Design a protein around this ligand. Structure first.
Ligand code: HEM
Ligand code: HEM
Lengths: 145, 145
C-alpha cells in the first residue's frame, strides 16, 4: 500500500534524495528533457503513450515535449518538498496517481523511469547509492498505481 | 493565444508577481487550501467539478483536497519561475491547459479563481496592485482555454 511504501523512506534515503535533487533540480528544463529522451531511447515502446507530444526526437526543439518535461520536474520538486511529512507525501502521491491510473500506466510501466533517472544521476556523478534512493521514491508512486 | 497574453506581463507586473509569491509560496499547503476553500465558498457551483475530492467541507483535514491544493501551488510555482522566458512560459501554460480543456473548464469558469487569489493576497496584506498582477497571469492561462 502507499502508506507502507512511504515508510521505506528512511533518514538516509531522504538525505540522499535531497542532496542529489539539489544538483538535478537546478536545471529543470535540461534534466527533464534529458530524462524524457532517455526514456524514449531506452524504452521505445512508451512513445505510444505520448502521441500528443508529436515528434519526440526533436528533444528540446519540440515545445510540447519541453512543456511536459518542465512540468514533470515540478512534480519531483513537490515530492522532495513533502519528505518531512509522510501524510502530505502520500496525499500528493495519490493525487498525482489519478491521471496515470486514467491512462492505464501500470506500476511496472511507471518503473521504466528508473533507468533514465540512474543515467541522469550518473551523468552528474551520483552513482548507485543515489539511483537506489530514487527507486524507493518511485516505488511509493508504483504502490499507488 | 498565449503569446499575446504573455506580452501583458511587463517588468512591473513580473516584479509584483515574484514579490507576492515570495510570501504566498512559502506555505503551499496552507495558502493552497485557503484558495480552494475560498473558491468553494464564493462560487459554490465550482464544487461540481470536484466530486472526486469528496467532503470538501473538511478543508485541510480532507486528504484529497489537501493533496489537490498542494499540487495546484506547484503549477503556480512553475509559472512564476518561467516569467523571464516567454517561450517556456507559453509551452508550460499550454501543457497545463490540456487537462483543463478536457474537463470543459472555459476561460470564464477558470476566471472564477481571481476573487480567491485577491482574498488570499489581501490576508497577507498584498492590495489591489498585486491582485491586478495575478489577474494578468491568470489571463495568460485563460488565453490557452
Ligand atoms: C517519476 C516520473 C514521472 C513523473 C514525475 C511524471 C509526471 C507527470 C506530470 C506532472 C504530468 C502532467 C499532469 C498529468 O497530466 O498527470 C504527467 C503526464 C503524463 N505522464 Fe507522467 N510522470 C512520470 C512518469 C511517466 C511514465 C513513466 C509514463 C508512461 C510510460 C507517464 C505517462 C504520462 C503521460 C502519457 C502523460 C501525458 C502527457 C501529455 O500528453 O501531455 N508518466 N506525468
Ligand atoms: C490558478 C488556478 C489553478 C491552478 C494553478 C490549477 C492547477 C491544477 C493542477 C496542477 C491540477 C492537477 C493536474 C491536472 O490534472 O490538470 C489541477 C486539476 C484540476 N483542476 Fe485546476 N487549477 C486552477 C484552477 C482551476 C479551476 C478554477 C477549476 C474549476 C472550477 C479547476 C478544476 C480542476 C479539476 C476538476 C482538477 C482535477 C481535480 C481532481 O479531481 O483531482 N482548476 N488544476
Amino acid at each position: 500500500s502507499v502508506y507502507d511504501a512511504a515508510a521505506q523512506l528512511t533518514a538516509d534515503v531522504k538525505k540522499d534524495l535531497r542532496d542529489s535533487w539539489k544538483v538535478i533540480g537546478s536545471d529543470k528544463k535540461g534534466n527533464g528533457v534529458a530524462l524524457m529522451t532517455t526514456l524514449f531511447a531506452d524504452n521505445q515502446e512508451t512513445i505510444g503513450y505520448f502521441k500528443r507530444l508529436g515528434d519526440v526526437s526533436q528533444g528540446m526543439a519540440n515545445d510540447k515535449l519541453r512543456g511536459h518535461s518542465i512540468v514533470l520536474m515540478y512534480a519531483l520538486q513537490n515530492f522532495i518538498d513533502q519528505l518531512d511529512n509522510p501524510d502530505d507525501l502520500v496525499c500528493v502521491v495519490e493525487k498525482f496517481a489519478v491521471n496515470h491510473i486514467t491512462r492505464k500506466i501500470s506500476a511496472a510501466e511507471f518503473g521504466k523511469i528508473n533507468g533514465p533517472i540512474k543515467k541522469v544521476l550518473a551523468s552528474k556523478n551520483f552513482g548507485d547509492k543515489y539511483a537506489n534512493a530514487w527507486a524507493k521514491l518511485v516505488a511509493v508512486v508504483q504502490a499507488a498505481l
